[model samples]
Target: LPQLKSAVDGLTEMSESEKSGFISLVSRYLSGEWSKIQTPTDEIVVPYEKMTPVSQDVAETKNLLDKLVVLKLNGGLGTTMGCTGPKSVIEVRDGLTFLDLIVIQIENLNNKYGCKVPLVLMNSFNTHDDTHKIVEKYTNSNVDIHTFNQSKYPRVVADEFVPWPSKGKTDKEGWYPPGHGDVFPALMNSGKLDTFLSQGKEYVFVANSDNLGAIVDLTILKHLIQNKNEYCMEVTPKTLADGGTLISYEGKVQLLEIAQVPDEHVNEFKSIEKFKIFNTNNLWVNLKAIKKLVEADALKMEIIPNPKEVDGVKVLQLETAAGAAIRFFDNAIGVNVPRSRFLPVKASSDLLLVQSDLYTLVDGFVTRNKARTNPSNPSIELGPEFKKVATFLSRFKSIPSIVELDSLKVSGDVWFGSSIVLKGKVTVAAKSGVKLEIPDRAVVENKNINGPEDL
Candidate 1:
């Protein structure tokens, strides 16, 4: 195995500025600089009641529309979902891809309110090629849709700084993209940061491409500007699926991810009351402030270790949370946002929820039906057999007519046929070794099934 210096030196295609930042990040990883073992006390919670609502006037909100821009993180491949290309271009509604929705959303906003808010994509090696190809038409118009590829780092062998090698899977360079923390550094390295700052852009809203709920709200811009917050993180109520929370460790704000929690404190880490706020991965950053932080070298984000299995070998991937940059600023704060802003489609089951009539497309945003009174949407569970991408897609010919599926849970091995309208709370479970199927034109309502049957 080569030494740390030699290992990092072998990698190419990085600018000096990016290389220096990478070395600092990896150096922190090499040392014992990652971990948050203690559970946060009650005093640190940034409760919803304490935050002020978006009450700025139309002029203020409209003024911010010009100073604000949208930055979508479009680096995922959804390979687990059997999508080998960029996930953004996958059609979610009426043959319109997520990219189409985003472009249309911004266009709608600009046209109705008469403002030109640019849409920027932070792409990666796995996604840049496809995303650029699909969004090319925007450049000819006034949409100002632009993209910048993020950085990459080598996946090192466990306990050794040398680059990992998998003869059967990949070459010696064996690379993996770091976490979204690369956004800030990559922006600087690619000259995008300078361009935004030079153009006098004040705030940039960053979110994932898969999240339709993360559209830019002018009120959020006014709130950030009014509060003079250098960094603002949007958080929502914690649920069983959520695994991270915001915490202030003795007056310093930071993100406490599940991996950082010790084995003994796992229960508390998942507690909704104790850690009530889950990071939404939606962030608002003052462009000028971030530029200053990067220039002064004062920003130090918490280090996170993500363990993975690659080619039958145990390896560690060093990562940092972009939201954790809250620690670098004194004016950083957390905003308690509604559940409407945190909806993310990560799997087939989640895709089913968004595609149904339970949500309506209004102004390019997917919103819950106002008739339902549930504070948050009902829970959904699919058993092991149906969770896989290929199996899940094959079982259901198309999205089911499930606008009434208030709370639907499917356990064990089961299949859903078309025209199945679900209502209220419903559960369909198969026995340990049983195979069940909900036949076509089945309308299930407020009931449970232990075997294959029709309602």
Candidate 2:
């Protein structure tokens, strides 16, 4: 046990506070009585419409920007997209990578308000290198190197305290990214949290790098400071493939993911209306408050255990979500943000949607183009065949003018060409052995696109 503790202790990158917290969690795991918290699935949804919107007064937003810093979770590689580099560098909009657009968005805000609100990335060890590569391009710009890396903990045997055996793998493979919860301590340990505090920065707005809409919200910042709250999570109505939400757990507000739901009530847990609000991964932190909480050893959160095997060794990953920290703050709350704020490109389908004119890069942020009259976001479902990155890129030489693809479904194998406009409900599919192509200058409306039919 002391051997494992010493191995974890010698990692120079880890902070003093993170080391203590990791040790305590490891000691808890040594006890072997792991019980999951059964949070109620039957809870009322947040009143999103009534939640305060960012003040229209640009001056007010500007004032708040001076006291704010933005965080982008640039931890994961786009493995699903088959990219081996940082996911943020994968281009999602017109020739601009996610990292490009995010930096542009921050630069736009800084220009708009004449304020230098810096952008910080919460990177994992795997991503920090490539991330800094792209960030290096922003030399002498408003974007600075305000990056922090997530903490690493040894993946150990469930019944004992020894590090998992390094059969043929490097010691690096034996460590795990301890979920976003590592953000709190990582920032503290990286000295950025203390640095920002020294600079009198009070609030931080954090979001995933893939989500461009997680821009700085002046109104949300005001709410955090106004109420003296330490954390705030933005949530929207749940949809397919989305997870996590705000709920009252044991008479206290907590951010709960599907994993936290008891299996007996999972059917109800999957309901959209029953548990309407889903986490957007956009978090606002009360920097000073968390500093006090962590330094005092008063900020321990629930552990999320994920069991997995690597190279024939079964190990447990002790995880924590950045959003899940809401429960630790007495004044923590959830904001009902619009669907636009939750735009994330986890796969090829999402990338295609962002490429279309339905979402315009207005002032460095992807805004729903005026052509989209539908109250809800466009319904886009790409089948399994076109979901992979290489297959998806090969299908569409260029994004058709999807200004009107409010309800678009592409199945089987379909390719798109230039100036292709879609209106109303459009379905493009091909027979099992055929390919479909929407010819150049084609307008598809309420039509079924089949390969043989076009041939």
Candidate 3:
């Protein structure tokens, strides 16, 4: 591994001013120093830990889920999925949109707890309007809804912000969403944070909109509340060669990001029997503590100004582009979580593989374990909708079914459906109709499958 000294030494060839600036950036990032102005103390921490288990019990989990100020980071353009608008608007389950699933999940909890839980969305310029329009379609006013725009970071190169020709009337032209890091400021500036605190809510659960498996659960919330920790970061074990984000500072676990570590250290960090990488993005914050830390030292939570190189020109990169440059503040803490809690949908293929499998596993676990004697109880009731899907799949002896699902009632372990499309020669169970309309070909495991009537 290259030592910090060596990394700094390499920059010596640059001019004195450039060297100084680079050194300062690295020192502040490593030491957790940055400055911000007007830091609000009455803020609530919002970390998005996987909420599969939370959804399972939301209906009957009591007041545990109420204390949470939930926010979904729905700023993603979904360009990767070749879709426009908020990815949350996408329908991942049986006629249920992502936002719908989340709202219903929260509704179930609210119904059971008799306490209104607010749902906030941190949207970008592209998504805010659409999200609002969709929310209006829903009639539930008891559940408070709020939206905030994320900070835009201009793409920079050589420490200078760039300008787009079309909007470049001045130097401050080109900018983009500075990744999820904007959550900090979005909470403070947008009055949403203040509103949450005014209601006596102390913590916030923030998670990606695409992570359908990520739900609010009591055990994780209780863990954060009881420990009084400033931050709780949910992480999963790196199951594949490039699966997790490992945080290491002077050989100590401090920060985490899958993009930061090298290949040689992958096994070293992965080998630690009990140590799982810190899922950098998913987090829970203690609003009070964060406010104190940011206030005492504005530098701790200040936005990082990063330069980017685009089209042979250098400019400051903000938003998603700024992610490569920013650093965490001092008062922040990274808490490890169980691997089962991490559910992310990053790629089109990921939706098919990891998230699909995880959703199934969670649903099945809840189905068998969480009995449904009490239908109105959010915690116990699988809901007629969920039960119907589960029962339907169970009919085919060897067909794929939603054995398990989250509180949002998203079905997992899909073996057959009209919308289902296998990419390869994958086998269908004894009595199943395999749908294949997707562009990719698949390999099925069970080939000699008879019709549903044969079963």
Candidate 4:
């Protein structure tokens, strides 16, 4: 309706381009026909490995780093981890936060090659202010840092399908970032895209800030530029726990997200054996192609209708993913990268893994411990007791050493002491209303310590 368009136009804070993008999404939402895109019927699933090229054989080219710009998706909050403010500001190792480590990583790269590789952060409205304050310390650093805020779209009332009226324009509950898909338009609208283009930057490597392993790979960069590919997605092998799968539909490479799969085929879509590989969210894209495709309005991404409740009111936030645009690009291909490049700390369990001796912070990378033989990280599941960052940190007197650990599960009021070693499928569970603590220099190898009775 005209009312919807006027409503979006009235948001004085939004730019003309952003208002247009929001209006288009709202128009599609109002139309019932768009819902069909989420439901799959007779969709072909082409194996990604057969179609995708591997990065191992590609030789690194000289001075490719100079033509590069590293962009990290720093839009997310740490509320899920029971922390306040931006997730990147949370400390991961040796008193250094995720943002600090990322800066160090890029700084090291620039120093080593003598190339001015700028670091771009795609911060959402929620993280924009605080992240700016945190990034201030790096003003004098070698790495060039630039920050841009993604579009802050208004949330729609679920059943009514109208914008929720909040107190003011600055109200956090009334707006959402509309996913990373906005990275395309947001970068252009914020003037960063053109800024990079004028600076002789040919390619942009994008990844999540939480994923420390998502470093700038020269081999992949060389392959993209030399082969003349417009878009490249790095995919790793799928485990039972992961998101987004790569496939070919209608003879074109595409990313099949879980939301796109029909309810009846959810199991089939998640089967690791059948799906094989998943998108690592590490992408290599041509800067020129991004400008050209976006200007032509050929960059149409799938709308993900996410439902949530705010202050007892049902609402739906329509979002789009950055990877979803892969199909729309020219000569898009998925690159099968190693598992090491996909490390993300979405939960406290993952935080424990990265903080422990299983990984060493070498020159800013969370390099795996050399003592471990397995390429795969040991599966860890900390109980509800260790769920939040505050509580999780308190429970560990000193982080446990897990280099030899294959699988570990600690539940219910369990505390760990210094120099603790966990190895080969270990589970420590405290019985109801009991507290269990592993003493100093304890080596728990292939055992289940269940409560004080078992210990």
Candidate 5:
């Protein structure tokens, strides 16, 4: 709490206007003013109830057939997970790197649609070379592959930029990922957006590489295209109390990235269904509308300054490394997709155990759907069951049993089993299970569950 107070007080180093803006942001967040943000009312929810289902043939005929550009934002350093290099390179699947699964999904869509949809990887200095090398192995010249870097912000403390000691003498000096918010600018500046426009591409599906479940879903793409929405963000219902983003201000749906939210509002955000906080990292932006939004307001998408503590000293944070302060443009549309669409792997331990189960569930779903599509092919649908497992495993596997029990007490989805012996009072969630011999009570949460491994 003191660190946060110090961080807030340090804003004095910023220019009067900048300091005021930062303080305003903090104030709004703390005050639970997120409901004030503009969001489509439930009345605006599109009702497809009366629409008749078209035959597959009819649907195929109606397909817009517009080319799609899939951009994989791969700038993460993976340091939080105690890993070096690009997080995408980590082998989360069975020998399948994050890039591999992404390309595979792209290929799957292309094969299904019979179109040449280009796949772009937005790679920063940390990920560019490695991403290219890894992707080249799976994709050839057929799929248009492009790479670009997002804007970088300098690390700042007390409004002064600070350089990392490890970085050698370079003209740019102290720079880091300005934040994923820079994706819009990065795309615009790369000239790739222009190329897509010229080529008559209709939509851009941008997703973070860390989310393995993110794929080019034609149903979602078709929905966006048909509605002609300006921007379509994918949002999953907040399963955990502390999960999801908060929106504030009337007519404005501000995405509260994890880095942006103040500590106080975290619980409140988790509690409100209206906040229905979305995961902004995964989005589908209509190219035409996005271009219009960006052109009308350059500053709207421009980066805002963020001051952070570095080496126990206050300095201005730059580069994408520190979360940059950027405002999203208006007329944007957020699509609340199912939670199954999000599967982000943030740590090595996550990759080893929890993510492993999640991946299996996803793969199972894919297999089921594919089989159902062609019964002769034995479609295996994993459905909500696996998705629940993924959500549970992600919350439970890492921490000590006592802490997990406390967390589960708050979030009911977490659970454990008899084989999973807890030294303390383990909270058994209605559906999921626990590991064995935990020092404290292992708590289980989430509503959906599959049976035990043998049972």
Candidate 6:
């Protein structure tokens, strides 16, 4: 009795829906749902080719674009890139921030096809204030913008199973948002769900703001609308061993993450031959199904029990992923899209590629260079000298021309001048105490250059 009451009232900040959700999360936690779920039987994993097929009639799909809503997850912080402010605000190309490019993309879409596609952002506590300030600039734009904050839950002490108190805390060390899985509840509680329903919107295209390749695709939208599928996730050919993939579980389409696999079969799950595709975090869901499941509290997403130490106090913060809710929707499926649809910038190395001539930004969408011979992106490895965004930008006079480059690696304190050309496999290294700079118009081909020694 005391335990339940104490956990619910630990923070006098959560709303009614948030409080109820928090209570349910802890109840599930205390009921011993802590360990990862067992892996599915072989053949349960569905092949992408067997899933739904998109319509090739692009003209018909354009007509249905008006009924769609574009939702982007904008809760990330740029701290990973050693910058302050929202990650969505980081400049990627031509001095246009991610948010700017997104708005421009939607605005262009709205104009080219006489349709009104609303752009919604799901913000976290860390990004709310700064994003709101920047959003004012697009007040007079063509697209309608809506923003909502994800629900926050306090961390629970590992031993006592009690929530950490939110008093005498100068920072948000004890409280945290429960990952993107909160998108469902946050959308309903913030009244954005009903608002869209009233506006005659039927489908929502959810994606991450950092992914420049996730543009509004009419072919996929047409498939979701015609096939009557409640949910569809965009999956791409897997290049890595980890991440989530679609599977057939108990006669239902589901998302099977690497975390769900048993230790013995972990290698089997990692085999690129067995699992040929991975989720792109680009989702298409029916508006009505989200309303139905969220209203019934039936969005049973897999819990990701995150264990951490807050100020040396052992705590557990339960989290869930948005993609994990695929099982709850009716006739859910995954469509194998091109690898170009999942471009993400989690580090400065990715930022380098997007900012370089290797990719072209047209009408707000970034596409691979047509002149490049290789279909796959060139391998790049930057040292700690180019770790942070500011330091990374200061070291380059201009983005290098990498159209013909095969692979490049830079280590230690190294800088580059303008109009540089890099081709084939190249390596550059500088001593710890020395700073190496490649002069202007330099041509570096399949060669290794050692700082000071090579000069």
Per-candidate alpha-carbon RMSD to the true structure: 3.6, 3.8, 12.4, 4.0, 10.7, 3.2
Per-residue alpha-carbon lDDT of model 3 for 172-289, expressed as tens digits?
3344555666576556756677787788888888778766656776766776665565566655544433333434343222443333446755555555452434453556776665
Estimate TM-scores for all models.
0.88, 0.87, 0.61, 0.92, 0.64, 0.92
Q: For residues 1-455, could you state the per-residue lDDT of candidate 6 as single tens digits? A: 35666656755776778778888777675674114333334223334445454456645555688789999998889998988989999998888999999999999988877788999999988899999999999999989999999897877778877677643332577777888888888899989999999999999999998998898877677667877878888888888523787766566667888777878878877888776778889999999999999999998787887889889888788888889999898867778777888888888888889889998888877778899998777778899779789999998999889988888899988999999999999899887788898998999889899876775
User: Which 10-residue span in candidate 4 carries the lowest summed lDDT?
Assistant: 33-42
Q: Between candidates 5 and 6, name the one with more favorable TM-score.
A: 6
Error of 1 at 332 (Å): 0.8
Give the range of the ten consecutive residues with the poorest summed lDDT in model 2.
Answer: 33-42
Comparing 1 with 6 on lDDT, the higher-scoring candidate is 6
Off by over 4 Å in 3: 1-63, 139-142, 157-173, 241-253, 258-275, 297-338, 353-443, 446-455
Prediction 6 global C-alpha lDDT: 0.82
lDDT of 4 by residue, 22-114 (tens): 877777766731132322122232223344333443123326777899999999999889988899998988889988898898898877767
Summed over model 1, clashes come to 0
lDDT of all predictions? 0.73, 0.75, 0.49, 0.82, 0.51, 0.82
Ranking of models by TM-score: 6, 4, 1, 2, 5, 3
What tens digits encode model 1's per-residue C-alpha lDDT throughout 1-455?
13565545655554566557667777877675224434444333344455555554655556778777789988788675666788787666665777888888888877766778888899887788888888886666557887898876666667544556332224523556677887887777778888877766788899988887887866567667877877888888787667567777756768877776778878867778677778898999988887788788776776776777776766666777788788787577777778788888777677777767677777667778776666666667776566555677677766666655677788887877887778888998888888788888887888898885443
Cα deviation of 216, candidate 4, in Å: 0.8
Question: Model 4 Cα displacement at 429 (Å)?
Answer: 1.6
* TM-score computed on alpha carbons, candidate 6: 0.92
Instruction: Give the C-alpha lDDT of model 3.
Output: 0.49
lDDT of 2 at 383: 85
